Design a protein around this ligand. Structure first.
Ligand SMILES: Nc1nc2c(ncn2[C@@H]2O[C@H](COP(=O)(O)OP(=O)(O)CP(=O)(O)O)[C@@H](O)[C@H]2O)c(=O)[nH]1
Ligand SMILES: [Mg+2]
Length: 214
């Protein structure tokens, strides 16, 4: 089973990764994990990636696709793989096709923007220890305090509402054509495509996934 899982930043698609991995006996793979592992390994692609990253440059789509192709040839992908959060653009999807990398399902994990903003802006952290909380959905023991140390909890600057909203605007503009691309691929019989309501309780999402995936 070969699955691409797509979702907006903050939607929390990763909440279903372990369910999928355990269902099919497949690893969760990502461009970030692939790059880190390649650089650490000193492989040929890893050396190219390290030189680019060490200069503060972005790896090319061609190198990213080559890393995907290499990753899925590894023995742990014999049963398939869960490719998390990539492709991100039509050019990247077409490069997957040109390279010969088809998947069985593309799953779009949807959460409304306003709920994403709620899910994120309510987060609070204790930076010294990296413990995190949420005001409405997972309140702390003592209002505004880490129930351990009692130091004033903070909010991460990346989690500021205006930064969150800007990220979502950019994501939808980038992703709309890609969703349409995969719906077309499904119409052509090359893959299957389904949207998932990620706002539901996790067991409800899981049941919806089971109906999609058979
Ligand atoms: N912080 C940050 N994240 C970004 C940016 N652009 C895209 N992202 C993506 O947004 C996500 C932010 O993480 P988080 O707020 O935990 O979102 P999430 O949906 O719960 C994480 P997951 O997709 O694994 O379930 C990351 O997956 C990150 O790769 C950016 O400019 N800043
Ligand atoms: Mg994830």
């Amino acid at each position: 089973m070969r699955i691409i899982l797509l979702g907006a930043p903050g939607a929390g698609k990763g909440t279903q990764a372990q369910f999928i991995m355990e269902k099919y006996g497949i690893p969760q793979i990502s461009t970030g994990d692939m790059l880190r592992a390649a650089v650490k390994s000193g492989s040929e692609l890893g050396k190219q990636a390290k030189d680019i990253m060490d200069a503060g440059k972005l790896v090319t789509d061609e190198l990213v696709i080559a890393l995907v192709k290499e990753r899925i040839a590894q023995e742990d992908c014999r049963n398939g793989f869960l490719l998390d959060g990539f492709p991100r653009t039509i050019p990247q999807a077409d490069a997957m096709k040109e390279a010969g990398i088809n998947v069985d399902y593309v799953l779009e994990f949807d959460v409304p923007d306003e709920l994403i903003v709620d899910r994120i802006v309510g987060r609070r952290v204790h930076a010294p220890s990296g413990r995190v909380y949420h005001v409405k959905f997972n309140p702390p023991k003592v209002e505004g305090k880490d129930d351990v140390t009692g130091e004033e909890l903070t909010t991460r600057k990346d989690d500021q509402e205006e930064t969150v909203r800007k990220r979502l605007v950019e994501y939808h503009q980038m992703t709309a054509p890609l969703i349409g691309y995969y719906s077309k691929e499904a119409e052509a019989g090359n893959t299957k495509y389904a949207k998932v309501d990620g706002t539901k309780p996790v067991a409800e999402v899981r049941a919806d996934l089971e109906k999609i995936l058979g």
